[model samples]
Target: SSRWSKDYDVCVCHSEEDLVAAQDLVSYLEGSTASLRCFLQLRDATPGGAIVSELCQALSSSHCRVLLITPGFLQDPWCKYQMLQALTEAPGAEGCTIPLLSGLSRAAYPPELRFMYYVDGRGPDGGFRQVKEAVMRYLQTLS
Candidate 1:
């Protein structure tokens, strides 16, 4: 289970409140590019402590992690787990483990995750398009 065969552009980590929005962005990104993978954890989590393991596995299989931040993102246990794992496992990967904050307010960081900069997923100041372009640009630079 350590290795994954499927390739992904980015793995989206989100909360229940943000799941609908997660699907929205994924659909838009895939339709626009009409290429590659974007995993959004579209399933139910069992009672066992498998969420963390699932997230670590997904992160390993992605070029980057986009956290769909919302008001309740930090409050959800599983969402918090995903965020912590991404931060710990993929710290400062340069276009990796990025935060695409949407429907989230300006709040103070909890100190540990204050190092990395986050992008705006919720519009006006640049929405999902900005995020998509950033990832694509990063890919282009590498290629």
Candidate 2:
């Protein structure tokens, strides 16, 4: 008997569109418990500035995995900072930051961080299925 409750806490640290989409996906995953937390760091202009640094610090103290919603991320310096900090400062964390790519070229990704997954935002499915699957896979490793 799996003691795993059907509920989950999903935090969306992206723009309004991405946040809404994430919530919609969570709703689609019926029977699972979910709580959404938003850090609202999208408005920050610098990737390595206070907002992202703080986000990394907060994530370090949390049990939740940090998922970097891509697509609109390139324009947001805060997202880049989070990705760099996660890879360098907090590699042990269980979360994965995936890039949701829109018109943004993959070339914009820092060469050192190319190993992470890139979710295509232009796809018909919106990559939510892949995101859900990846989260499930990560959850399995916990126990």
Candidate 3:
């Protein structure tokens, strides 16, 4: 399957304020199961690559994208752009974009992603398992 050509199964899109949460998610996705290839700009991006180019590459190189929308994310212009980019990349592509909401509410959910149901990333459990399941499910649809 051409899906094999992609470098990662999931690309985590998040704001700097949510860095720790994003890190935890990446660790779980990589270590808990069969070890999914996950792209995190801070660790996986090529050095010296332009910021915009790097983000664009990451968005297209991954089979799925997890938009971690937190209060900080809403304040970040880049995160907002990433959300738009993800939507435009695969508009209405089932399970392609996982909207993980943290420290936010349904009322605050981005209008652009209203059509795609979001996973509530609050509470003690934080929905990592659900995120993993979603990623696996999306990958299954590819190959």
Candidate 4:
């Protein structure tokens, strides 16, 4: 299953405008006691490679994916592309795809993630815990 060999535990997908938020989430995930490995396109992907290839590689290399949903995210083409490809790559894996909503509403949620429960990013602490818990749960099954 390559469960223990994946490069990252969670791949964070977000818009350029949401970089600050993404960094905050990454810090919480990677700095905590759990010390989860995270893939952040902005920091992890080295230059010189085609953006698509790098993104796709991250998608497959990570065990779980987090789509940071916000106004900027929906408008960003790359973020949207990642969201679709992430879903296709792991369509129905329980606790694998996490859509974190920040300044977004249930009514505005993407239909593609309609069936999966999402963590509300309005409360940073609560949302971070949910994301961590979901990733941990998935890893537990693999072990």
Candidate 5:
């Protein structure tokens, strides 16, 4: 990996609509921490570089994988797939997933997926505070 990150702190999976927010987060986490597959990291051609496969690989190496859930997310097949994959591979909030609700309410999540903790992506803070805490806390465990 480049000096930017040995392995990312989080692999942020989001819809096209939420990419701006995710990119800001990638910027916010830079220097002190790092995020993967944002504008900062290219997911170009590789033998294992298919979006789905790369998402799985990113989730495995990263300290956590963040789902930036929005109404647009549910509509996009790729976004939903990434979220489902994260949920399946990570299992719970205590594991490698950190879901952030943005432009959607708690009701947006299905019954089966509501049990995990999630950060509220509303207000001026955009829930970055809580999400950052989750990322930093997970990083400590890796040490």
Candidate 6:
């Protein structure tokens, strides 16, 4: 069941516009297998330290691919740790983790993190086609 669930995995972490764009891509592809995870506001306003830990713990236990929506990704240590831990723990496995940049700077990414696809929300037509094509191509690789 877990293996079956991993087939159409997608994770969206981007601006509202990019999130909308990602939702469109999912719609176009008729995605129905995997679920999207996001964090809600907290009372502390101390950033996502706690949230990050919980996310990493959950990710470590899951078989799904973790996709980080970039540009704003660097600000969250939890996201960084999740990416790092995923790559560290799953070295040489099939492609199970990746980052999707949404008009964010690659320089913000630490040297250890390398995104498989960069969704340029700043591209012509907001790079939705590029994002779509890349996602489709990545999915094909899984099949």
- Provide TM-scores for the models: 0.77, 0.55, 0.90, 0.89, 0.77, 0.47
Model 4 lDDT tens row, 75-117: 8898899899989988885767888888878898887788887
Worst 10 residues of 6 by lDDT: 36-45
Give the poorly placed runs of model 1, Cα more than 4 Å off. Answer: 1-6, 43-49, 121-129
Tens-place lDDT digits, model 5, residues 31-86: 45444333222432145457666667766666667778888988888877777877
Pick the winner on TM-score between candidates 2 and 5.
Answer: 5
Write candidate 3's Cα lDDT for 75-133 as tens digits.
Answer: 88998888889888989758888887888878887787777777876656566446788
* lDDT, model 5: 0.66
Which candidate do you rate higher for lDDT, 5 or 6?
5
The model with the greater lDDT, 2 or 6, is 2
Error of 6 at 100 (Å): 0.4
Q: Weakest 10 consecutive residues, lDDT, candidate 1?
A: 43-52
Kindly list the per-residue Cα lDDT of model 1 for residues 1-143, writing each as its tens digit: 32334567777888877678678767777787756567777642334557667677777777767787777886788888888888877676677766777665556444566676778545664353467787787666755
Candidate 5 off by > 4 Å: 1-6, 31-48
| Structure candidate 4, residue pairs in collision | none
CA shift of 23, model 6, Å:
7.1
* lDDT value, residue 87 of candidate 2: 62
Prediction 3 global C-alpha lDDT: 0.82
Give candidate 6 regions above 4 Å deviation.
1-54, 106-108, 114-143
- The sequence of per-residue lDDT tens digits that candidate 6 reaches over residues 14-103 is 233234544554454344324432222131114645765655554554443435455545676555565666677566545555455555
lDDT of 5 at 135: 64
